[PDB]
C-alpha cells in the first residue's frame, strides 16, 4: 500500500511521537473528545469529564493515550504486515466497545492535527502524505474485519 520511501517517512515522523508518547496521546484524545463529544460517551472511564481543563488534569486519560499510541506504533512498525496485531484490535472495538469506523476516521484526523500543532513547520507535505496513507491502510484493514462481523454500523 506504501512504498519503502513512504514507510521510511512514517517511522521518521513516529520518532517525534516516541520522544513524548504521553503528551502526544493526551492531545490526540482531547482533540477527539472536544471535536466530537459523542466519542466521549463510549468511555465510562471518561464520561465524567466535561471541560478540557478537567481532561487536561486527568492522569488516567494520559495513561489511556499511552496505551493507544503504543498499540498504533506497534502496528506501524510492521509496515503493513500487521494482520496478527490488528485482528484482536478490530474484534474488541467492534464487539466489545462498539466503535463505528467513523470514529477511527475521526482519531486519524486528530493525529494529523496534533502533529502539525506540536511540530509547526517540521511536519512536511511529504511526511503528511505518508502518515495519511498509513492511517488509511490501518483503517481500511479494520474496515474489512468490521464487514466480516457485520458491525453494520
Which residues here bind ligand HEM, judged by CB under 6 A? 39, 42-43, 45, 67-68, 71-72, 89, 92-93, 97, 99, 103-104, 107
Please give the annotated binding residues for nitrite, written as ranges: 64
Please give the annotated binding residues for heme b, written as ranges: 93
**In angstroms, what is the minimal distance from the CB of 127 to ligand HEM?**
18
Nearer to ligand HEM, 4 or 74 (CB): 74
- Which DSSP symbol is given to 146? H
Crossing angle of the two packed helices 125-149 and 101-118, in degrees rounded to 10: 160
Nearer to ligand HEM, 106 or 123 (CB): 106
Q: Convert 126-141 to b/e letters by CB count within 10 Å (16 or more is b).
A: ebeebbebbbebbeeb
Please give the annotated binding residues for O2, written as ranges: 64
**In angstroms, what is the minimal distance from the CB of 47 to ligand HEM?**
10
Instruction: Report in angstroms the alpha-carbon separations of 141 from 65, 98, 151.
Output: 22, 17, 14
**In angstroms, what is the minimal distance from the CB of 128 to ligand HEM?**
17
**In angstroms, what is the minimal distance from the CB of 60 to ligand HEM?**
9
CB closest to ligand HEM, residue no: 92
Amino acid at each position: 500500500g506504501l512504498s519503502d520511501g513512504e514507510w521510511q517517512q512514517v517511522l521518521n515522523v513516529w520518532g517525534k511521537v516516541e520522544a513524548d508518547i504521553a503528551g502526544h496521546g493526551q492531545e490526540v484524545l482531547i482533540r477527539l473528545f472536544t471535536g466530537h463529544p459523542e466519542t466521549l460517551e463510549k468511555f465510562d472511564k471518561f464520561k465524567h469529564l466535561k471541560t478540557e481543563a478537567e481532561m487536561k488534569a486527568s492522569e488516567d486519560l494520559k495513561k489511556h493515550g499511552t496505551v493507544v499510541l503504543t498499540a498504533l506504533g506497534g502496528i506501524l512498525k510492521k509496515k503493513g504486515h500487521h494482520e496478527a496485531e490488528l485482528k484482536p484490535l478490530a474484534q474488541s472495538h467492534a464487539t466489545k466497545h462498539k466503535i463505528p469506523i467513523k470514529y477511527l476516521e475521526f482519531i486519524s484526523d486528530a493525529i494529523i492535527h496534533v502533529l502539525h500543532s506540536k511540530h509547526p513547520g517540521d511536519f512536511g507535505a511529504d511526511a503528511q502524505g505518508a502518515m495519511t496513507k498509513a492511517l488509511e491502510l490501518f483503517r481500511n484493514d479494520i474496515a474489512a474485519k468490521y464487514k466480516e462481523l457485520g458491525f453494520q454500523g
